[PDB]
Amino acid sequence: TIKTLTTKDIDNLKVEIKDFTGLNTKDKLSSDDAKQESQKAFDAINKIVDAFAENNKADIKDKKISDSTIAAANNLKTKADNALKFVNENASVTNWTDDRVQDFVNNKVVKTKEINDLLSQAKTDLKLQ
């Protein structure tokens, strides 16, 4: 059965990720917290990708996520997966160094605004709200 996304489903896909700005040492950001937040972001973006795919499977011409938005969702999924892999590989006392904490915070971790921008762009593509 064909089923497309409403504004309520997209709002139900929103998630808030902890802000790690300014945490630049291992005593201020544990690998467990980084792992938990990266897992949160990964799971949320996976659900978002699956929901977008199911929406577009309906093949309703005026209720379509643009290919650009689909690609952006896939790229954000890749970023979240890379962040989770980075934390998992470097969680130990030996590998979770200040340099790796700074690398995670500045380059790897997913931020709430990225997911929210993706969802709002999806809303625009579907002419919702």
CA distance 58 to 67: 15
Residue 9 lies in a domain: no
For residue 89, being part of any structural domain is answered with yes
Query: In this structure, is residue 18 part of a structural domain?
Result: no
Domain assignment of residue 22, yes or no? no
Torsion of CA 102, 108, 113, 114, to 10 degrees: 160
Q: If DSSP codes are grouped into helix, strand and coil, which group holds residue 72?
A: helix
Token representation of residue 20: 């790690």
Structure obtained using: X-ray
23 belongs to a structural domain: no
User: Which of these, 44, 50, 43, 37, lies nearest to 108 by C-alpha position?
Assistant: 37
> Phi and psi dihedrals of 40, rounded to 5?
-55, -50
Q: For tokens 């199911």, name the residue.
A: 54
Name the resolution in angstroms.
2.0
35: containing domain: 29-125
Domain count, the chain: 1
22 CB burial (10 A radius; 0-12, 13-18, 19+): exposed
